[PDB]
């Protein structure tokens, strides 16, 4: 299937407490593979997945130098935005960026993107065309104009279509045993009493990879999506994922409800019941 290479950047000012906190976290698909954190003893880019042991020392040295430069550019940004928004130097503020590319199963580019937020709200974003920007407010309009005069979109586009794609392909090759595997979900159902002769049935899916999955409950051959409660799919600490979905049913009628689990590692979807 398709794959993605993403970099999540966060810079957070802390007036009275020194320099902003700066972090970069890189992902291939939904697996963390590299990270930089300014609050580390000796901040450096580090591997977060075993397969990254395949890069030599020069890789780490370059990524580290880049991160240090980025840290300084975001420090400048935090100051600049105080000016654009006419805010005080006493408050903490946050800049976030997500940059990435996605390829299909054949390795060809599907899409690229870069989006910025300030204090949790959209700031500026590269358009789907990889040629122009869209600005959320008049501050971002200042940025758009700067970036247009400097030709930044062209350089970013070259990164997104080029470098980003080539390195993603390389990671998929190097980390194939991890990234291209399939771990099938194991499922089970738990049962919990409630007042008013009702019961909560919870369908668990455990130990799966990749993260995409669908869990539904059915009655009378219909999905009950409207009445379910669930959690967002979540990492389980070892590179696999888990999820649950529950429904509340009448007591004594549990046998009429079935949980269904659909996943890449399930040629036929699982069907379970309490």
């Amino acid at each position: 299937g398709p794959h993605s290479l993403r970099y999540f950047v966060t810079a957070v000012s802390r007036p009275g407490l020194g320099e902003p906190r700066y972090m970069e976290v890189g992902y291939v698909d939904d697996t963390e593979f590299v990270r930089f954190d300014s609050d580390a003893e000796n901040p450096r880019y580090e591997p977060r997945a075993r397969w990254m042991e395949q890069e030599g020392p020069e890789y780490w040295e370059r990524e580290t130098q880049k991160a240090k430069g980025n840290e300084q550019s975001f420090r400048v940004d935090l100051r600049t935005l105080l000016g654009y928004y006419n805010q005080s130097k006493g408050g903490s503020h946050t800049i976030q960026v997500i940059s990435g590319c996605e390829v299909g199963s054949d390795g060809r580019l599907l899409r690229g993107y870069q989006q910025y937020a300030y204090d949790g709200c959209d700031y500026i974003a590269l358009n789907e065309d990889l040629k122009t920007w869209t600005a959320a407010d008049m501050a971002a309009l200042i940025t758009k104009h700067k970036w247009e005069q400097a030709g930044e979109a062209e350089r970013l586009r070259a990164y997104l279509e080029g470098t980003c794609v080539e390195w993603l392909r390389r990671y998929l090759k190097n980390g194939n045993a991890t990234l291209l595997r399939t771990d099938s979900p194991k499922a089970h159902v738990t049962h919990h009493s409630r007042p008013e002769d009702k019961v909560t049935l919870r369908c668990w899916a455990l130990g799966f990879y990749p993260a995409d999955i669908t869990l539904t409950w059915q009655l009378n051959g219909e999905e009950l999506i409207q009445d379910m409660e669930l959690v967002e799919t979540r990492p389980a600490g070892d590179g696999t994922f888990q999820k649950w979905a529950s429904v509340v049913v009448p007591l004594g009628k549990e046998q009429y409800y079935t949980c269904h689990v659909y996943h890449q590692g399930l040629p036929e979807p699982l069907t379970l019941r309490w």
Partner: peptide, 9 residues
């Protein structure tokens, strides 16, 4: 391989 050179806002 990370973006380098995030242009200033």
């Amino acid at each position: 391989f990370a973006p380098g050179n995030y242009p200033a806002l």
